[PDB]
Scaffold this active site. Structure first.
Site, mmCIF file in Angstrom:
data_model
loop_
_atom_site.group_PDB
_atom_site.id
_atom_site.type_symbol
_atom_site.label_atom_id
_atom_site.label_comp_id
_atom_site.label_asym_id
_atom_site.label_seq_id
_atom_site.Cartn_x
_atom_site.Cartn_y
_atom_site.Cartn_z
ATOM 1 N N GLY A 100 0.822 -1.101 -0.003
ATOM 2 C CA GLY A 100 -0.010 0.018 0.268
ATOM 3 C C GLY A 100 0.810 1.134 -0.110
ATOM 4 O O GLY A 100 0.393 2.240 0.403
ATOM 5 N N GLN A 101 2.024 1.253 -0.640
ATOM 6 C CA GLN A 101 3.024 2.264 -0.370
ATOM 7 C C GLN A 101 2.359 3.211 -1.634
ATOM 8 O O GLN A 101 1.744 3.078 -2.528
ATOM 9 N N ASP A 102 2.808 4.627 -1.345
ATOM 10 C CA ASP A 102 2.281 5.539 -2.248
ATOM 11 C C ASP A 102 2.668 5.395 -3.597
ATOM 12 O O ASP A 102 2.218 5.566 -4.679
ATOM 13 N N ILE A 135 3.582 2.447 -4.689
ATOM 14 C CA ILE A 135 2.997 1.243 -5.003
ATOM 15 C C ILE A 135 1.857 1.065 -5.110
ATOM 16 O O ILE A 135 1.259 0.130 -5.732
ATOM 17 N N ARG A 136 1.027 2.169 -4.807
ATOM 18 C CA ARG A 136 -0.562 2.228 -4.861
ATOM 19 C C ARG A 136 -0.852 2.087 -6.513
ATOM 20 O O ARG A 136 -1.799 1.238 -6.651
#
Ligand code: GTP
Ligand code: GTP
Ligand code: MG
Ligand code: MG
Lengths: 415, 180, 18, 137, 180
Positions: free
Chosen positions: E69-71, E73-74
């Site tokens: 849920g990384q920015d 990686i979103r």
């Protein structure tokens, strides 16, 4: 005014060369390949190259570049005509245009090159006439070349006098992406395969608009050909005077006349294509084909080429009539139909996935082209009236001809 | 001559009939055709060309040829006028801005002497929002009563639900066939 | 038979034009 | 010709039905020869029309002439171009030599009423050719 | 053609199925995947990339691909949409500030025309603190009932213990598999 016509290969090796004037050194052919590579890599490639004060005009053959070097301001059109005649002669003598025959028939090739043109001025161009003096398996030159009739060899005898004509139609349609047809031209083709005895002089008569108007019969269906070009055997004076088509037919298949005029009628095939291309998710092919031709006519071997995505994969075809095969080599979907009766309506629904990664560069929108060919159909309505076959000895001829309608430049602009 | 074979075929059902599907784009014509053919709400991309299908009901094979309402495909409906016995017009009551364009297209299509034996068939599509009009307001706006020598009937069908399609099919069958 | 339209017999001239 | 006799009654009925004043393409029957009508063939057709009737005295019309030409082409392969009338005003002579039929006034040339009339001298005298030497080449 | 081999394979179980693992970072996705595959809570660093594993249960191999849920990686969730048939969503009810971001991410991911055949699989993670919401308050806040044509099921699972994982697996099997 080419200095020497040579035959090259795909790797830059000259298959055969023959100097005619000697004003240019034969070593200039080596620089032709790097110049072509530079021009292609920079978009400046053209058929007529230029190595300083010498122009290297070449055309792309089946497997070799017919390069004809020249030094002065020679007739470029004359060089092109000579090259076309040489290509036709090679095709007639050699069934294949590749390196297998260039290195296999050089013994007759040198003689043919020497006889065809001298000093940059072409002299012999009749393939049938040239076959009577130059063979690969020699007598004096035939008198037909010296005589006025260089397209009808005298003394030919046949058991029967049967001539097979060909009414070849070329349907060229340029439909823009907006749905309107811009370039709609139909080019006629009157090609006959004459096989008779002697030197018959054909007296052609058809349903021409100009001829009917001159005779006063300009009220029925008459073809008004915008461009009408007679063959070599056709006498220009007779056609110029009163449209008298009188000429000596050649021995074999030849193109006598070729009509060329625009068309103001509806297209024979109406193709409506839809593109439900998801953004890197999927694509839809809402292809609908409506046959505007007469119901009594069938389009045999119909192949409606629909360009699919360049990176498209895993396609699914939901059609109604006609086999659909996706050819990765062409990068398009061919709506293949064996026989398409006139008035038919085939609906297709294409569906395939797309890679998640977007393409780095655009691929363009090639137009959609169909390969319909419906014989025994005359859209232009031009009807052949008579063919005056007259022989000095006197014989009863049985001419034959078939009308074939095919798809020419029938491209449809994509959305 | 003898017509015994025709009577034998008609004793078990021989008449099929035809139908046409025309109207503006995004008017539910494709969805209606899919429901008539299959009976499910199928999602499709806009109809660049046209779709032809057949429906077997009441012993009549009502073949319907869907036609899109695209600007480049609007003038392509003249190809279907040859060998046509019916014509169906799909209205879009949820598009006030395109109502005038749809009316003009319908008037142009009905202003052809070739399509004379095809009676009017107007279906009210998109019957799922409160903004949809009734069965009389749409007809009054379109002026269906001013079509001389045209048998027009207004039927409301919901694409999502499928109700009202049977009534329209029955009306079309009654207009096409005048027997028991 | 032959694809592309069967061969048909042709006349010698316009008999209706004399 | 049984086929010509059979088609004559229907053709005459269709011509009578049409008053005196849809599919695209040019389909062609396979192997059917197509050529203009000959002088002897034209004379035979004129004689057959005169004997069967329905052609002599009929009011000349474009639609009836076109229907007759189409029927002749269908039944014999003769192009519907030899059934031409000489330019007016007055009696219109057959365009093709040998034809026994001609159009004469029955009362602008287009507003004049014309009727088909039999003429045996037309098959022997080239009145139209003499009137219009340029049109005959 | 013959399908005897397919029936013979299916006599003892042939269907495998797939699954997806999406959600915000630190939502118990790695621990939940470890518990599903191994059966223990394994401490792991933040998922910079993704974790791919397979689990065999009920004769079905449910492949699970963890998604961070990384920015940065979103927006990479679109890559996993290809060849994906299932999807499991893990919520973080303990992050009131991140609840809106998670809801927005779910809405954005649910608005993809390619991801339509995958039903909703909501996992209520962090179901061990008193601040954790119930199975309906979280659904009401996320508006799960407003997802048309989406088969969503809300299940609460405790990362420390593992209660409710079997119920979620059974519900997923019932939703995907339509046989006895
Ligand atoms: N939600 C909803 N949308 C509808 C309904 N009826 C019609 N529509 C809309 O109408 C459109 C109909 O699309 P299709 O039937 O597949 O194709 P079409 O009506 O022929 O339109 P074109 O393809 O452009 O010619 C859909 O995209 C819907 O958005 C309905 O009952 N409910
Ligand atoms: N104490 C406790 N912490 C939990 C529980 N469930 C989730 N967490 C927290 O959630 C975090 C999730 O870690 P992982 O499951 O290994 O990895 P992840 O869920 O994919 O999170 P990212 O790797 O950052 O994307 C852990 O570091 C825990 O602090 C639980 O049941 N008890
Ligand atoms: Mg549609
Ligand atoms: Mg993790």
């Amino acid at each position: 005014s080419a200095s020497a016509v040579y035959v090259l290969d795909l790797k830059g090796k000259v298959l055969i060369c023959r100097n005619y004037r000697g004003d240019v050194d034969m070593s200039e052919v080596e620089h032709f390949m790097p110049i072509l590579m530079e021009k292609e890599e920079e978009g400046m490639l053209s058929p007529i190259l230029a190595h300083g004060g010498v122009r290297f005009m070449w055309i792309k053959h089946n497997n070799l570049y017919l390069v004809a070097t020249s030094k002065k301001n020679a007739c470029v059109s004359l060089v092109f005509s000579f090259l076309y005649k040489v290509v036709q002669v090679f095709s007639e003598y050699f069934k294949e245009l590749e390196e297998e025959s260039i290195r296999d028939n050089f013994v007759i090739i040198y003689e043919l090159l020497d006889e065809l043109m001298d000093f940059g001025y072409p002299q012999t161009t009749d393939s049938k006439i040239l076959q009577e003096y130059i063979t690969q398996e020699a007598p004096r030159p035939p008198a037909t070349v010296t005589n006025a009739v260089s397209w009808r060899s005298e003394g030919i005898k046949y058991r029967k006098n049967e001539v097979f004509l060909d009414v070849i139609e070329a349907v060229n349609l340029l439909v823009s992406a907006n749905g309107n047809v811009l370039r709609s031209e139909i080019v006629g083709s009157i090609k006959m395969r004459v096989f008779l005895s002697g030197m018959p002089e054909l007296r052609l008569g058809l349903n021409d608009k100009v001829l009917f108007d001159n005779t006063g019969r300009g009220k029925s269906k008459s073809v008004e050909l915008e461009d009408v070009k007679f063959h070599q055997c056709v006498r220009l004076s007779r056609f110029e005077n009163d449209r008298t088509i009188s000429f000596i037919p050649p021995d074999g298949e030849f193109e006598l006349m070729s009509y060329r005029l625009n068309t103001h009628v509806k297209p024979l095939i109406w193709i409506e294509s839809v593109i439900e291309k998801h953004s890197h998710s999927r694509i839809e092919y809402m292809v609908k084909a409506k046959s505007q031709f007469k119901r009594r006519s069938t389009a045999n071997n119909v192949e409606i080429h629909i360009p699919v995505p360049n990176d498209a994969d895993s396609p699914k075809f939901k059609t109604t009539v006609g086999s659909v095969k996706w050819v990765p080599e062409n990068s398009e979907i061919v709506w293949s139909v064996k026989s398409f009766p006139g008035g038919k309506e085939y609906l297709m629904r294409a569906h395939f996935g797309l890679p998640s990664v977007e393409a780095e560069d655009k691929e363009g929108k090639p137009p959609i082209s169909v390969k319909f060919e419906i014989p025994y159909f005359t859209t232009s309505g031009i009807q052949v009236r008579y063919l005056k076959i007259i022989e000095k000895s006197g014989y009863q001829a049985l001419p034959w001809v078939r009308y074939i309608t095919q798809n020419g430049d029938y491209q449809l602009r994509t959305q | 001559g003898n017509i015994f074979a025709n009577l034998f075929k008609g004793l078990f059902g021989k008449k099929e009939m035809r139908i046409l599907m025309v109207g503006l784009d995004a008017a539910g014509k494709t969805t209606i055709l899919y429901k008539l053919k299959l009976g499910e709400i199928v999602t499709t991309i806009p109809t660049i060309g046209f779709n032809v299908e057949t429906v077997e009901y009441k012993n009549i094979s009502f073949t319907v040829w869907d036609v899109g309402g695209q600007d480049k495909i609007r003038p392509l409906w003249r190809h279907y006028f040859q060998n046509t016995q019916g014509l169906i017009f799909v209205v879009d009551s949820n598009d006030r801005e395109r109502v005038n364009e749809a009316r003009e297209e319908l008037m142009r299509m009905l202003a052809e002497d070739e399509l004379r034996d095809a009676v009017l068939l107007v279906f009210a599509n998109k019957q799922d929002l409160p903004n949809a009009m009734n069965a009389a307001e749409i007809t009054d706006k379109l002026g269906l009563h001013s079509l001389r020598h045209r048998n027009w009937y207004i039927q409301a069908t919901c694409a999502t639900s499928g109700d009202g399609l049977y009534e329209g099919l029955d009306w079309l069958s009654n207009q096409l066939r005048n027997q028991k | 038979d032959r694809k592309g339209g069967s061969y048909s017999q042709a006349a010698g001239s316009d008999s209706a034009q004399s | 010709s049984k086929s010509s006799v059979i088609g004559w009654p229907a053709v005459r009925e269709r011509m009578r039905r049409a008053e005196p004043a849809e599919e695209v393409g040019f389909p062609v029957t396979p192997q059917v020869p197509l050529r203009p009508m000959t002088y002897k063939a034209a004379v035979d057709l004129s004689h057959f029309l005169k004997e069967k009737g329905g052609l002599e005295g009929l009011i000349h019309s474009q639609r009836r002439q076109d229907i007759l030409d189409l029927w002749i082409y269908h039944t014999q392969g003769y192009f519907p171009d030899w059934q031409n009338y000489t330019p007016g005003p007055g009696v219109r002579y057959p365009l093709t030599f040998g034809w026994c039929y001609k159009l004469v006034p029955v009362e602008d040339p287009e507003r004049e009423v014309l009727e088909w009339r039999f003429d045996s001298r037309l098959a022997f005298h080239h009145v139209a050719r003499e009137l219009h030497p340029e049109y005959f080449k």
